Design a protein around this ligand. Sequence first.
Ligand code: TA1
Ligand code: GTP
Ligand code: ANP
Ligand code: GDP
Ligand code: MG
Ligand code: MG
Lengths: 408, 424, 317
Amino acid sequence: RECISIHVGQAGVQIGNACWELYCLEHGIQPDGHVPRAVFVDLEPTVIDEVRTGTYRQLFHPEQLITGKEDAANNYARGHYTIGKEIIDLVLDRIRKLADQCTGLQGFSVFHSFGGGTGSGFTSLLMERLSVDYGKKSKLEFSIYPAPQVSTAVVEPYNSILTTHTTLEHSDCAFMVDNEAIYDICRRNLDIERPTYTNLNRLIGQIVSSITASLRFDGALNVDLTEFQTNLVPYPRGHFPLATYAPVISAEKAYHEQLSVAEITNACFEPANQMVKCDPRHGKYMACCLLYRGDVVPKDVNAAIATIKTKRTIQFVDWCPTGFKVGINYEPPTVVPGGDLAKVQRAVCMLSNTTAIAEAWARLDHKFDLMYAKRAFVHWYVGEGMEEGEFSEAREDMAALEKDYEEV
Amino acid sequence: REIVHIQAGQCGNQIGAKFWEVISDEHGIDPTGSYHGDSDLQLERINVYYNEAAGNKYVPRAILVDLEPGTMDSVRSGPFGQIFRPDNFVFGQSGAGNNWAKGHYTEGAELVDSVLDVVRKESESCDCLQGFQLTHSLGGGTGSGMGTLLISKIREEYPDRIMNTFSVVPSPKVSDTVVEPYNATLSVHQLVENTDETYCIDNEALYDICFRTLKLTTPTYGDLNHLVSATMSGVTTCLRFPGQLNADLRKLAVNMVPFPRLHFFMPGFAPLTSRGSQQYRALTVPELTQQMFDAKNMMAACDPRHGRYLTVAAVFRGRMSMKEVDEQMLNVQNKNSSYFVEWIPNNVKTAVCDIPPRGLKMSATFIGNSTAIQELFKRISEQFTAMFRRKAFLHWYTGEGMDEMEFTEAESNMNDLVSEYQQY
Amino acid sequence: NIKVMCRFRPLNEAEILRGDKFIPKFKGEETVVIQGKPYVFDRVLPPNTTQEQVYNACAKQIVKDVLEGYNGTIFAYGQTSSGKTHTMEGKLHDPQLMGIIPRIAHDIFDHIYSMDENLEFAIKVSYFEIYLDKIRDLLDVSKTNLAVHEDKNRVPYVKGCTERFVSSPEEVMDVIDEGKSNRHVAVTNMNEHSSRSHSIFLINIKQENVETEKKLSGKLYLVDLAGSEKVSKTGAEGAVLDEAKNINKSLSALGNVISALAEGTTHVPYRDSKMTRILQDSLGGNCRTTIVICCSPSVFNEAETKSTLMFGQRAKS
Ligand SMILES: CC(=O)O[C@H]1C(=O)[C@@]2(C)[C@H]([C@H](OC(=O)c3ccccc3)[C@]3(O)C[C@H](OC(=O)[C@H](O)[C@@H](NC(=O)c4ccccc4)c4ccccc4)C(C)=C1C3(C)C)[C@]1(OC(C)=O)CO[C@@H]1C[C@@H]2O
Ligand SMILES: Nc1nc2c(ncn2[C@@H]2O[C@H](COP(=O)(O)OP(=O)(O)OP(=O)(O)O)[C@@H](O)[C@H]2O)c(=O)[nH]1
Ligand SMILES: Nc1ncnc2c1ncn2[C@@H]1O[C@H](COP(=O)(O)OP(=O)(O)NP(=O)(O)O)[C@@H](O)[C@H]1O
Ligand SMILES: Nc1nc2c(ncn2[C@@H]2O[C@H](COP(=O)(O)OP(=O)(O)O)[C@@H](O)[C@H]2O)c(=O)[nH]1
Ligand SMILES: [Mg+2]
Ligand SMILES: [Mg+2]
């Protein structure tokens, strides 16, 4: 029934604090109410401390807040092997101590930031140690994969070609939200050149609320977590769909809010609104899980979607007749009291697997080579319990992910 | 985490006074007083540079190494001079001769053990050690020789903890000493093979940047020092603060050093505007990258525009949009694709603290690993040969128990170091 | 030119049906298949190639050139149970099961006393390991670091390395027995030999032309690279596993740049590590270099063998 969550890496933790905020906010549980149902991991204390100092301070147990005073290191190796190792046990312990206390759970919604040290590496083995300790569950990891041109870390790809290959054979469904492609939404669909990280977080903090929160919440067309991976992954590769939200209108500027279904659904497939720089440049969808929430008439959907199924310029895969999982919830969305999110009475958080990422992976793989081709910051990992193996052999890995997403 | 500063020589020492002059205020620590901190955040991470004894006396955890009493006796007899526990003062009343050899093999070699002693008392302080900060000048005895030894020993004692080195490489135009390239070439040698992060500053790159980027007409040393100390605060201490995207010595190291040499960087501060007037506040952000990435404004002597970059680390520290930050960095990477090396898709390492420099709204330390610094070790290396050839003031070295093959060694080494850097 | 030679060791009957089975498909005498792989490189020695056969292709020429006063390097690599011990030395006295070092020693003393009538030979052997990137002399193991100095040309060499005369094969074996008895080997089961320290065996062929007083000095470096491993996880293990992982990775990485520079690319990472200062005379001047890579079927060996394959393969393709 439930779904634990492990927010790993400063980012996965910032996003965590955010997604975790939106929650109570739409469940009437102020600062000090019940008890969360997740954990927080990082090898840099000062960040998890922000959850220990700032807002939502006492809504957590100093037990579901793991830290390694030591060093973060923007390098996979160190975070996965060398350092990150020391903490893992302890980490697991909570996701085994928190996994027990419950009643017939469904899985762990993992939150990490692909191109980091604590986020890429660590998790790599966290999800790793999970796939074995609970192979019998769902492993949906919600990632924030590398901005297409606006990356941060100098090595980023090293850290992301490595978190992909190690987690690939362990996740159930990996959701992806592109940091940059979300900015566009903040520039083009909300207008603001002042987007603090605290915003992108409010956003995913939204799209995510549509996943677990509301879905695990009764409705006219419930959709379990398992449901996803089933209706969402055509093949064992921990396939990565993309998150998209519909009413991403500004709560100040424009106001046409009342945008009946027929509209908000069409607003999902236009590439300028998908939290991912994977513009359907050719990528044929192969399965979409249209999660709606708020006042929505099933016919409205079983029509708005029909209209789409026949737009053709939206070309769905061949081997797939119908790939539209319509998830209907009741309670409309719940926007931050005064952030910058419109606040409509219905939304569409559609996620999907698109042959599109054939790109995104490509463009991120190429990156890697360029540097590996010169070993660039290699000495930083080797000296951290890794080898020419793990790199070269994780490159070959993704290679068959460029062929996979091509063949399917 | 933690670190333990090291004030090798006079310069490295003089600067200590400025690095600590600053840092303290950037941590509300009065002379012997405690934490008056305008805030409450300038304390949760102090440990990195102090120690708990009394309850109002957080003492800087640095080392003051020097063979010339008068110096440390000027730093200890002035302002903040009375905050260092006397145990910190590892003096060498000997003749602090201006010979690299006199402070590395003959005179310094003695005072070393009585130093390492303390560098261990401080390391075994508490919690977990990160690395050590090292200040000095590569143009003298107690600086290049004895300080370059202090590290060769440190790096044998904890080849785990990092080693940032702040070197005052011999300025071009005019040398404030005569053997300079001797004391220098010999210390860079030791550097390229022990510390793993070096920030080279040039007394004249500063003047310039301090007399034209600060209409400042009488740039006393105190100033230069002050400017420098401003950068080393943005680096370390800073990142030991919260941030949307924070890093720490390692990140900085593990994102900036593609190849083990250790490589040397060139620090650059952000808001560098003259007092009154200039206080333009054009600091939205494009203004900071405008700054940081220009030629002038690079504490180094060489000009970036004269050679690609391998890595860059804009360590910003002041509330800003991870968008207007992450974004700017890009255009910058495309307007200058020319010089920014290609085999690294994203040279830049964006870092972002939160709290800014006490009195400022927004700043951003720049740590560049450009291939341009080739044209400096060249310089140094040249000066050597031109004088080595005639063994100029060599008798002051050999006569101190040195080797004719020692000088050969260093030059070559450091000389090869020039070579490599071009390979990129 | 640097040439890469793969050597597969054969399986013994006790392991053909234990768990270890063939993964190496051989094609011709120069391609080895493994999952995906359409060409290999220059030569693959099968699990049917003699010790003598490996020695002819790999070392015989290098020994010949060394006797005329040139440098040569033979590098060795391969993980645990890959066949390294069997190729380099084998058994110390075995008429055809003997390795590379006992054969070179036999060929050296077959020319000496048959061709000395103006040549005065002195065969000097030196044996040192690089452990925690410090040069430990193995003829006196109270030494925990040892330094390089530079020669007449400004090229570094290991000064103070204890050298000894050898004038018959026996004294060479006695140096090997002495050095192996203090080599850092992980205590596993008796069969496994987990090398945590890289070994450099120097044969310095000094020959003196007694008539003109011209001296020649060919260096044969037999470098045993322990190599970068398929081992377990680290981060709460205080073994010499973590310590070895840092040594093997730093040296294999420098490896990668060195073949890439030998098959072309402006000068670069010389004087970076002690290994790369020891082998400085061997690399860049008139030298020859053979890298002998081993790897048995036992599935883990696929890891190091693929490592030796890629050292080779990047360069020629
Ligand atoms: C009224 C007002 O706003 O005054 C400013 C000011 O006028 C300017 C010109 C300051 C001023 O700095 C200098 O004039 C300067 C003198 C010698 C060497 C280098 C700089 C200032 O003195 C410096 C001072 O800096 C700080 O307070 C930072 O926290 C800084 N602190 C120190 O360097 C420091 C100085 C004395 C004692 C202890 C610390 C810092 C920077 C980075 C990391 C840690 C601390 C500031 C904003 C100002 C004055 C006071 C006029 C500027 O410098 C800095 C480092 O902020 C020079 O260009 C900038 C722009 C500022 O607006
Ligand atoms: N959406 C979003 N992305 C973030 C956030 N914080 C960081 N990121 C992104 O995630 C990556 C940064 O990872 P880091 O913060 O460097 O590292 P980490 O994954 O927390 O772990 P360490 O490297 O060990 O510190 C970059 O690509 C950032 O753009 C956040 O709050 N929200
Ligand atoms: N060609 C061969 N013929 C007979 N026995 C062999 C042969 N090659 C290897 N062996 C044996 O198989 C084992 C592998 O030996 P060596 O001991 O040669 O391995 P490595 O040296 O491959 N091992 P390691 O050092 O632990 O990484 C030993 O028991 C050898 O005696
Ligand atoms: N920035 C800066 N440079 C200094 C200071 N003092 C000496 N220097 C420089 O250091 C070099 C001289 O070395 P010195 O410090 O006297 O050596 P030591 O005292 O014998 O170790 C010259 O290049 C000076 O410009 C200083 O307080 N600040
Ligand atoms: Mg972090
Ligand atoms: Mg062996």
